[PDB]
Scaffold this active site. Structure first.
Site, PDB file in Angstrom:
ATOM      1  N   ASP B  25       0.565  -1.608 -12.293  1.00 14.60           N
ATOM      2  CA  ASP B  25       0.533  -2.867 -11.536  1.00 14.60           C
ATOM      3  C   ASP B  25      -0.072  -4.062 -12.285  1.00 14.60           C
ATOM      4  O   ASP B  25      -1.288  -4.217 -12.371  1.00 14.60           O
ATOM      5  CB  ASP B  25      -0.185  -2.648 -10.206  1.00 14.60           C
ATOM      6  CG  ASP B  25      -0.029  -3.820  -9.260  1.00 14.60           C
ATOM      7  OD1 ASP B  25       0.566  -4.841  -9.656  1.00 14.60           O
ATOM      8  OD2 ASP B  25      -0.482  -3.714  -8.108  1.00 14.60           O
ATOM      9  N   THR B  26       0.803  -4.938 -12.757  1.00 14.47           N
ATOM     10  CA  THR B  26       0.417  -6.134 -13.511  1.00 14.47           C
ATOM     11  C   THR B  26      -0.288  -7.191 -12.653  1.00 14.47           C
ATOM     12  O   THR B  26      -0.940  -8.093 -13.180  1.00 14.47           O
ATOM     13  CB  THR B  26       1.665  -6.773 -14.167  1.00 14.47           C
ATOM     14  OG1 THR B  26       2.636  -7.090 -13.157  1.00 14.47           O
ATOM     15  CG2 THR B  26       2.278  -5.816 -15.181  1.00 14.47           C
ATOM     16  N   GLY B  27      -0.120  -7.079 -11.337  1.00 11.40           N
ATOM     17  CA  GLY B  27      -0.777  -7.939 -10.363  1.00 11.40           C
ATOM     18  C   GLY B  27      -2.201  -7.525 -10.023  1.00 11.40           C
ATOM     19  O   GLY B  27      -2.908  -8.260  -9.355  1.00 11.40           O
TER      20      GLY B  27
HETATM   21  C1  LIG Z   1       2.877  -7.824  -1.475  1.00 12.24           C
HETATM   22  C2  LIG Z   1       3.384  -6.408  -1.413  1.00 12.24           C
HETATM   23  C3  LIG Z   1       4.705  -6.181  -0.796  1.00 12.24           C
HETATM   24  O1  LIG Z   1       5.340  -7.242  -0.352  1.00 12.24           O
HETATM   25  C4  LIG Z   1       5.224  -4.898  -0.699  1.00 12.24           C
HETATM   26  C5  LIG Z   1       4.506  -3.809  -1.197  1.00 12.24           C
HETATM   27  C6  LIG Z   1       3.250  -3.967  -1.785  1.00 12.24           C
HETATM   28  C7  LIG Z   1       2.656  -5.220  -1.908  1.00 12.24           C
HETATM   29  C8  LIG Z   1       1.302  -5.370  -2.520  1.00 12.24           C
HETATM   30  O2  LIG Z   1       0.431  -5.888  -1.838  1.00 12.24           O
HETATM   31  N1  LIG Z   1       1.105  -4.952  -3.763  1.00 12.24           N
HETATM   32  C9  LIG Z   1      -0.204  -4.915  -4.398  1.00 12.24           C
HETATM   33  C10 LIG Z   1      -0.519  -3.478  -4.797  1.00 12.24           C
HETATM   34  S1  LIG Z   1      -1.374  -2.648  -3.492  1.00 12.24           S
HETATM   35  C11 LIG Z   1      -0.158  -2.015  -2.501  1.00 12.24           C
HETATM   36  C12 LIG Z   1      -0.075  -2.419  -1.167  1.00 12.24           C
HETATM   37  C13 LIG Z   1       0.914  -1.892  -0.342  1.00 12.24           C
HETATM   38  C14 LIG Z   1       1.816  -0.949  -0.846  1.00 12.24           C
HETATM   39  C15 LIG Z   1       1.732  -0.545  -2.179  1.00 12.24           C
HETATM   40  C16 LIG Z   1       0.748  -1.091  -3.009  1.00 12.24           C
HETATM   41  C17 LIG Z   1      -0.236  -5.899  -5.572  1.00 12.24           C
HETATM   42  O3  LIG Z   1       0.520  -5.410  -6.682  1.00 12.24           O
HETATM   43  C18 LIG Z   1      -1.642  -6.172  -6.102  1.00 12.24           C
HETATM   44  N2  LIG Z   1      -2.251  -7.375  -5.507  1.00 12.24           N
HETATM   45  C19 LIG Z   1      -1.711  -8.519  -6.239  1.00 12.24           C
HETATM   46  C20 LIG Z   1      -2.302  -9.826  -5.713  1.00 12.24           C
HETATM   47  C21 LIG Z   1      -1.877 -10.113  -4.271  1.00 12.24           C
HETATM   48  C22 LIG Z   1      -2.516 -11.407  -3.771  1.00 12.24           C
HETATM   49  C23 LIG Z   1      -4.040 -11.333  -3.867  1.00 12.24           C
HETATM   50  C24 LIG Z   1      -4.482 -11.053  -5.300  1.00 12.24           C
HETATM   51  C25 LIG Z   1      -3.817  -9.810  -5.882  1.00 12.24           C
HETATM   52  C26 LIG Z   1      -4.395  -8.548  -5.252  1.00 12.24           C
HETATM   53  C27 LIG Z   1      -3.701  -7.260  -5.666  1.00 12.24           C
HETATM   54  C28 LIG Z   1      -4.221  -6.148  -4.790  1.00 12.24           C
HETATM   55  O4  LIG Z   1      -3.654  -5.858  -3.749  1.00 12.24           O
HETATM   56  N3  LIG Z   1      -5.314  -5.536  -5.209  1.00 12.24           N
HETATM   57  C29 LIG Z   1      -5.699  -4.179  -4.850  1.00 12.24           C
HETATM   58  C30 LIG Z   1      -7.216  -4.196  -4.682  1.00 12.24           C
HETATM   59  C31 LIG Z   1      -5.067  -3.650  -3.551  1.00 12.24           C
HETATM   60  C32 LIG Z   1      -5.275  -3.285  -6.023  1.00 12.24           C
END
Ligand SMILES: Cc1c(O)cccc1C(=O)N[C@@H](CSc1ccccc1)[C@H](O)CN1C[C@H]2CCCC[C@H]2C[C@H]1C(=O)NC(C)(C)C
Lengths: 99, 99
Positions: B25-27
């Protein structure tokens, strides 16, 4: 380009004639931008967030330019702490992970 | 390897005899794993996601094997929706975004 990860992979995007900074985000399925108005009909949507679901607005078939690469796809708008470009559009611009 | 983004970039990780699955995860700034007891000193931490903060334990100097690559660094442990490999370790294994 090739983007390394010593720093957050943030690039400039263009949408609706506006310039914004957005995070290339391989762990997100969808693309979510901070609150803004876009042209056209939108549907209410819930995405899975920390401590519960987050309400967003879904806009479909929106032209968006990402680091100079054109995409046309779904953009979610809502109270995200950061503009994020997810896999739905990373695939359209031919983005891969490599190591 | 090249990893495409048509589906979630999930890979097998090993930590200390445990064999899990996790998103590249690059985010994510940092690596966040679901329930596991790691050795050594922990420090409480709050980290941002969409919709709120998650309270985690921060451990330093934790070896994780990721796709056959040896990484060592900070691992956060808390109620994360998915096991995540963040930039702190993605850089160590030489991971880049390419488009
Ligand atoms: C936005 C989104 C969708 O539309 C669909 C599926 C997943 C996500 C999602 O939120 N993905 C995240 C992974 S955590 C995750 C959450 C749910 C499912 C799978 C992974 C992002 O890649 C990471 N995400 C990117 C980014 C989002 C906005 C706030 C700052 C960062 C925070 C970071 C994050 O959440 N940090 C953790 C502490 C949870 C690791």
């Amino acid at each position: 380009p090739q983007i390394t990860l010593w720093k957050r992979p943030i690039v400039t995007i263009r949408i609706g004639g506006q310039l914004k900074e957005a995070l290339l985000d391989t762990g997100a399925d969808d693309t979510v931008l901070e609150e803004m108005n876009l042209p056209g009909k939108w549907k209410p949507k819930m995405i899975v967030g920390i401590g519960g679901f987050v309400k967003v607005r879904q806009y479909d078939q929106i032209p968006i330019e990402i680091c100079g690469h054109k995409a046309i796809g779904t953009v979610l708008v809502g109270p995200t702490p950061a503009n994020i470009i997810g896999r739905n559009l990373l695939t359209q611009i031919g983005c891969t992970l490599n190591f």
